[PDB]
Amino acid sequence: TTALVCDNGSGLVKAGFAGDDAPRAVFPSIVGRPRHQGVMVGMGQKDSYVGDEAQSKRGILTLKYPIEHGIITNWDDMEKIWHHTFYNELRVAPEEHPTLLTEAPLNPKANREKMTQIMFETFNVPAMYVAIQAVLSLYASGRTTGIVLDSGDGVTHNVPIYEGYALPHAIMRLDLAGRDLTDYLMKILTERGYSFVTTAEREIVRDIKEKLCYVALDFENEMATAASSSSLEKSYELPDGQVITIGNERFRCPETLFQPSFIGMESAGIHETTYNSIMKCDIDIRKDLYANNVMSGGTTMYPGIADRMQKEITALAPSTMKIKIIAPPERKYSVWIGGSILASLSTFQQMWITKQEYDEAGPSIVHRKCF
Amino acid sequence: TTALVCDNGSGLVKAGFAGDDAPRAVFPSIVGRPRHQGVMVGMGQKDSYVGDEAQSKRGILTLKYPIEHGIITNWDDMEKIWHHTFYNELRVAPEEHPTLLTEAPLNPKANREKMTQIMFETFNVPAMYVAIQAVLSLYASGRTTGIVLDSGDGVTHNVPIYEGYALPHAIMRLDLAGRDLTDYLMKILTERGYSFVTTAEREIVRDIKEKLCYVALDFENEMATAASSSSLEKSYELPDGQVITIGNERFRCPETLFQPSFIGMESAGIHETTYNSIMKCDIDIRKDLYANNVMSGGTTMYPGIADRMQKEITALAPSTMKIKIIAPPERKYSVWIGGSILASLSTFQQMWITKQEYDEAGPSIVH
Amino acid sequence: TTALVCDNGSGLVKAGFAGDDAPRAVFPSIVGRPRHQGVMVGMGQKDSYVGDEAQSKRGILTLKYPIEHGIITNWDDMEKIWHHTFYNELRVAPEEHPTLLTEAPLNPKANREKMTQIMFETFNVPAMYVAIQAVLSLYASGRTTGIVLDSGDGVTHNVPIYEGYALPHAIMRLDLAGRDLTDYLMKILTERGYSFVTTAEREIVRDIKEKLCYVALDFENEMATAASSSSLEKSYELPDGQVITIGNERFRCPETLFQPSFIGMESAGIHETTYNSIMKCDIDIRKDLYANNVMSGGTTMYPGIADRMQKEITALAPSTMKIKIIAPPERKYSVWIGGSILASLSTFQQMWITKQEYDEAGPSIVHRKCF
Ligand SMILES: Nc1ncnc2c1ncn2[C@@H]1O[C@H](COP(=O)(O)OP(=O)(O)O)[C@@H](O)[C@H]1O
Ligand SMILES: Nc1ncnc2c1ncn2[C@@H]1O[C@H](COP(=O)(O)OP(=O)(O)O)[C@@H](O)[C@H]1O
Ligand SMILES: Nc1ncnc2c1ncn2[C@@H]1O[C@H](COP(=O)(O)OP(=O)(O)O)[C@@H](O)[C@H]1O
Ligand SMILES: [Mg+2]
Ligand SMILES: [Mg+2]
Ligand SMILES: [Mg+2]
C-alpha cells in the first residue's frame, strides 16, 4: 500500500512510511546479551535486547554492533533488528508494503545480495530497492547539481552530481567516522585520569562527544588559548554522580576529521577529499560544485564544522571561485527524507524489484540500473 | 506434599512449611550436657538437651554451638538438632516433604556436600535445595534490584542484585557478627566490676545486649554526653536478683560493626563494605543500588542503625545520589519469608535435587 | 658521574647503576604502620617500615602499596620509598648522578609531572628521563623489531616496534596483572576452607602463587584430569606450621590471564590482545611481529605460559605464518637491563632533561620527544 523507507546506518535505525515528514522510529542498532554468568532460561529471564532495550539495561549487557564500516557482519543480529523494527517499532506486516533501503557506495556485492535474499525469503516483501545515500541527500536538499559529503558512524563518502547525472569516477570513500572519533576520545580521556573500557562506557563517551565536542576554526591558536586560559573548560556528570572536567579534548576529538594522522591513518582530510573529488570532474562542472557543497549525517552536526570547511576549501580553491557550504538544520535525517521523497515519486514506481523478477533473474538483479 | 523451609542460622533455628506467613518453630541452636560430674545412666537421668531444653537447664549444663561463622563443626550435634526440629518442633516425617535449606556465600564445598549427604541418607528426604540468604531476603522484600546486607551470629555478607541478575564479583563476606559483639560486651563489662565467664553467663549477656544496646548517630559526641551526663544509664536485673547499671557500653558494643578495630581486626566497616561492593559494580547500576539498600538478620535490629548507615553512605556517596535504607520491621525473618515464597513458586519446582539425580550424579550436583 | 637506573614497578623496586649486569637492590614497594593501638613516640618505637622492614614485621603492621595499576596514589609514601632506596639501599647522594625512570604507557600526565617535580625539588638530581618499559625490554633483548608483552603487578601492555620505529596506534593496555591474580587466588582458596583476609595473609598467598601456580596447555582436559586424579595435588607449609593442600587452583589462578571473565571483566585474553595489536599494524610488518614475540615481567614467569601463548597465536594466525615466543630466563629484570643499556649509550647523553631546561621550559618538558 504505502512504501516503507528504512535507513540502516551504523548504530542508528531510522524507519517510517513514504510521504511522511520524519522517521517515526529512531533507536540504536545494538544487540545486548548478559555477561556475568550463564542465563538459565527454564524460568523468567531473557537473553537478547534490541535498541533502547539494551541501552536501558546496558549495565549488565555486552552490546553488539551488527554493522561495521557500512558492512553487515552479524546477520542473525541483523535479522532480529529488522524483525523488531518491523513488528514492534512500526508493528506492521512486511508482506504488504514495499521497502526502500540504503547503502554506502563501493560496498561488496555480497552485502546487497544477502540483504535482498533476507528481504525476500525471511520476509515476503512484495518489492524492494537499494539506493545510494548521497543521492537521497541531494533529493532532500531539492537540488539536482552538487557534491554531497555524508559522514555517519562507519563511512564518510563524497558523491558529485551535476544536473541529474552521476560521476562514478570521482566517488571517494573514507573509513573515518563517528565511531573512530568516539574511540579516539576514549583514548585521549585517559590523560586526565578518566578510564572507560566497556561498551556501556563507550556509550557514555559517545554521549559526552555529542554533548560537548565542537570544531575549532584554527587549531593551533585554539590550542594556545586552551593552554593559556581556562575559559574552554566544561563539566559533565556521569550516571553514578561523578563529575568530570574536559578541556582541549572538546576540539581535539573532532580534529581527526581534518587530520586523520591523529589515529595513524595515511588518508587526507575531508576538505582535501572534497577538493580532490571536485578536481577530478570536468572543468566546466567545477564552478557549480563549488557553489553547492552539502553535508548530511550525524558526524556533520559538530558546531563550527561548516565554517571550518568553507575556510579550508576557500584556501584550496582559486580566489575567483564562489563557495558556500549548505548545512541544513536537519542534516541528520536528510537521507531518510530524500528516500521518502523518491519513494513518493510516480517515476520511481517502475524501479521496484518485484517477487517474480527476483525469482527469475536471480541475485544478479540487485545491481541493475533501471532509471 | 508441602515443602519445608528451614533457615539454619548460627544460634537460632527457624523452620516451617512453604506458604506460611512466619516460621512456626524458633529456638536456639544449642546442645547442653551436664558439667559437674559423670552422669550415670543406669537410671532416670539424661545427658543431652536441645534448644529451649538447654536454655531452661543452663545452670547445670555446658552449651554447644554446632555452627561457627556459618560453618558446621560438630556434625553429631547437627544431626540431633535436625532430628529434634523434625520430630518434636514440627513433629513431621521428613520422607514425604522436600526441604529447602540456606547457606552463607563463599562457604566451603564440604559443608554443602555433608548437608546433602545427611539430608539424603540419615533422612530419606525426597528432594532438597540450598539457596543463598541474600537472594531470599530480596525475594521477601519484593524487589528484583538492590544490594542486601545480612548480618547474623557468625557472618555478615553483601550481595548486589540488579533486576534478577547476580554480581558474583562484588560479593563480600565479613566474620564480624552478633557473637563477636556479645564477646566484646562481656569483655567490656569487666570495667564496672561485672564478671561473666560461663556459657549461661554468655546467654545472659546476649540478652542484655539485645535488650539495652543501641547504635549512636555520632560516636564521639555521644561519648562526651555520656561522660558529662548520666541520662544514658540503664538498669538490668540478673536472674538471681542482682541489679547492674550500664552506661556508654550500650552504644560502645554495637560500634564494633562500624569500627572493627575495637576487637583487633583489620577489616572496614559495614558501610565501607557496602560502598566498596557498590563501587565494584558497573557505573550504570550504581544509582539503583544506592536507591535500594536492604538489611536483614538479627544483628540489624539495633535502634538507630539505619539512620547511621544512611548518614555514612551519604557521606561516602556523591551529593547528587539518592539513597534510602530499607529496614522493614520484620528483618529478623526475611530469609525464611523469602525461602517460603521461593518454595511456593511454580518455576522453582524444577530446581529440586531428587533422589535419583543425587544417586547418579553424586555429591558434585550440589553446586 | 654514573647514571642511576631505577625501575619503579608496582610492589617491587629495582635500582642500580648504569653499566651493571643486574639491579643491586630489590625489595617490595610497601610501607607498613602499626595497627593494634596508638604508637606513643615519646620513647623507642617507630611508626613506619619500608621494604623488607615491613615484610619482616608484617605480623603487627598494615601494609601499603603506593602504586595502583601503574599510577602513584600516595605521594608521601613514594617520597619515603625513594629516600630509602637512595640513602640505605644504594646509600648514594642523588645530587651527583642523573636518574633514569620507567613508566607504563597511556598513563596520566600528572604522574610524570609529579615524578619530575619531586626528582628536581626534593632531590636535586642533575637530570632525569622517563622511558617506556617495553622499549627497554626490546633493548635488553637486543632486537630492533618485535612486539613486547610486559605484565607486572598492575599493568599489562603491548607495544609493537618495527626496526626502531614505534607504532603508537597499536599500543594496548590492560589492568589485569599479578595483584588481581593474587586476589583471585585468595577468593578461590575459600572453597577448601582456607581464609586469608589481612595484608600479611595476602603476602603469604602471593608467595603461594609464585611457588605453586602454573599455566596449563589445555584448560578443560587439565580440569578433567584434576577431577579424576589426585596427581596434581601440592602441599604448602604456613609460617605457623599449618600445612595446606591445593589442587586445580594451581592452574585455575593464572587462567584469568587468558580468561578475564573469571574476575568479571569484559576484556579479551593476552593472546587475543597480542593478535589484535598485530592485526592493527600494516600488512608488510605482521610477519616480523609474528616471528618476534617477547614477554617480560614477573607475571610472565609461570611455567608453561610461552607454549600456551604460542599455541593460541598459532590457532589465531594463518597456517603459513612462522611464530616463536621469546621468553629469556631473566624476563624479570629485562626492563632494568634495557634501561642500563640505554643509559650507557653515548647517543642517550643528549636526552637528559637538565636543571635549567626544566627550570625554564616548565613541567611541559616531560612529554618532549628529543630523540
Ligand atoms: N550533535 C551531535 N554532535 C556530534 N556527533 C553527533 C551528533 N549527533 C549524532 N552524532 C554522531 O553521528 C553518528 C552517526 O549518526 P547518523 O549518521 O545520524 O546515523 P547513521 O550513522 O547510523 O546513519 C553517531 O555515532 C553520533 O556519535
Ligand atoms: N533486638 C535485637 N537487638 C540486638 N541484637 C539482636 C536482636 N535480636 C536478635 N539479635 C541478635 O541477632 C543474632 C542472630 O540472630 P538472627 O540473625 O536472627 O538468626 P541467625 O543468625 O541464627 O540466622 C543473635 O546473636 C542476637 O544476639
Ligand atoms: N616465579 C613467579 N611465578 C609467578 N608469579 C611471579 C613469579 N615471580 C614474580 N611473580 C609476580 O610478578 C609480580 C610483579 O613482578 P615484576 O613485574 O617483576 O615487578 P613489578 O611489577 O614491580 O615491575 C608480582 O606480584 C609477583 O606475584
Ligand atoms: Mg547515514
Ligand atoms: Mg540469618
Ligand atoms: Mg615491570
- Greatest Cα pair distance in chain C: 73
The angle formed by the CA atoms of residues B100, B85 and B108, to the nearest 5 degrees, is 50
Contact B167 C264 (CB under 8 A): yes
Nearest CA to ligand 2 atom 3: B210
What is d(CA C252, CA C209) in angstroms, rounded to the nearest whole number?
11
Task: Report DSSP state, residue A326.
Answer: B
> What are the residue boundaries of the structural domains of chain B, listed by start?
1-27+69-134+334-367, 28-68, 135-181+271-333, 182-270
Pocket probe for ligand 2: among B153, B205, B296, the residue whose CB has the most ligand atoms within 8 Å is: B153
Residue written as cell 629469556? Answer: C328
Contact B266 C35 (CB under 8 A): yes
Strand, helix or coil for residue A3: coil
Instruction: Please give the residue of chain C at the shortest CA–CA distance from B174.
Output: C197
Sheet architecture: strand order including C99-103: C25-27, C12-17, C4-9, C99-103, C127-132, C353-354
- Greatest Cα pair distance in chain A: 73
Residue A64, all three cell numbers: 553488539
The angle formed by the CA atoms of residues C238, C240 and C243, to the nearest 5 degrees, is 40
Q: Which of A35, A191, A264 sits opposite C169 (nearest CB)?
A: A264
The superfamily CATH assigns to domain B135-181+271-333 is ATPase, nucleotide binding domain (3.30.420.40)
**Which class would CATH give C1-27+69-134+334-367?**
alpha beta
For residues B79 and B118, is the Cβ–Cβ distance under 8 A? yes
DSSP B46-109: -S-EETHHHHHTGGGEEEE-SEETTEE--HHHHHHHHHHIIIIIS---GGGS-EEEEE-TT--H
Residue written as cell 606513643? Answer: C40
Q: Which of B285, B286, B320 sits opposite A60 (nearest CB)?
A: B285
What is d(CA B262, CA B183) in angstroms, rounded to the nearest whole number?
12
For residues A125 and A119, is the Cβ–Cβ distance under 8 A? yes
For residues A120 and A129, is the Cβ–Cβ distance under 8 A? no
Q: Does B259 touch chain C (CB under 8 A)?
A: no
For residues C55 and C30, is the Cβ–Cβ distance under 8 A? yes
Beta-sheet strands, E only, within A10-48? 12-17, 25-27, 31-34
Helix axes B270-279, B305-316, angle to 10 degrees: 40
Distance from CA of A308 to the nearest CA of C (A): 27
Topology adopted by domain C28-68: Actin; Chain A, domain 2 (2.30.36)
Contact C199 B266 (CB under 8 A): yes
Q: C172-174 and C165-166: which strand pairing?
A: unpaired
Q: Does B329 touch chain C (CB under 8 A)?
A: no
Q: Which of C109, C167, C168 sits opposite A191 (nearest CB)?
A: C109
SS3 content of chain A, % helix, strand, coil (to 5): 45, 20, 35
For residues A103 and A112, is the Cβ–Cβ distance under 8 A? yes
Please measure the distance between the N-terminal and C-terminal CA atoms of chain A and give it in whole angstroms.
22
Residue C144, all three cell numbers: 630492533
Strand, helix or coil for residue C232: coil
Closest CA to B297 of B143, B186, B178, B166: B178
For residues A182 and A311, is the Cβ–Cβ distance under 8 A? no
Contact B108 C193 (CB under 8 A): yes
DSSP B184-227: HHHHHGGGGT----SHHHHHHHHHHHHHH----SSHHHHHHHHH
The pair phi, psi for residue C334, each rounded to 5°, is: -65, -40
How many C-alpha atoms does A231 have within 13 Å on its Cβ side? 6
Residue A48, all three cell numbers: 537478547
Distance from CA of B6 to the nearest CA of C (A): 24
Q: Does B95 touch chain C (CB under 8 A)?
A: no
C182-270 has which CATH code? 3.90.640.10
For residues A7 and A153, is the Cβ–Cβ distance under 8 A? no
The pair phi, psi for residue A245, each rounded to 5°, is: -120, 135
Q: Do domains A28-68 and A135-181+271-333 have the same CATH topology?
A: no
Contacts of C282 (CB under 8 A, 6+ apart): none
Closest CA to A211 of A300, A302, A150, A299: A302
Q: How long, in residues, is chain C?
A: 371
Query: Which residues on A lie below 8 Å from C167 (Cβ)?
Result: 264
For residues C355 and C127, is the Cβ–Cβ distance under 8 A? yes
Pocket probe for ligand 3: among C67, C137, C153, the residue whose CB has the most ligand atoms within 8 Å is: C153
Residue B120 neighbours by CB distance under 10 Å: 19
DSSP C252-279: HSGGGGT-GGGGT--PPPHHHHHHHHHH
Q: How long, in residues, is chain A?
A: 371
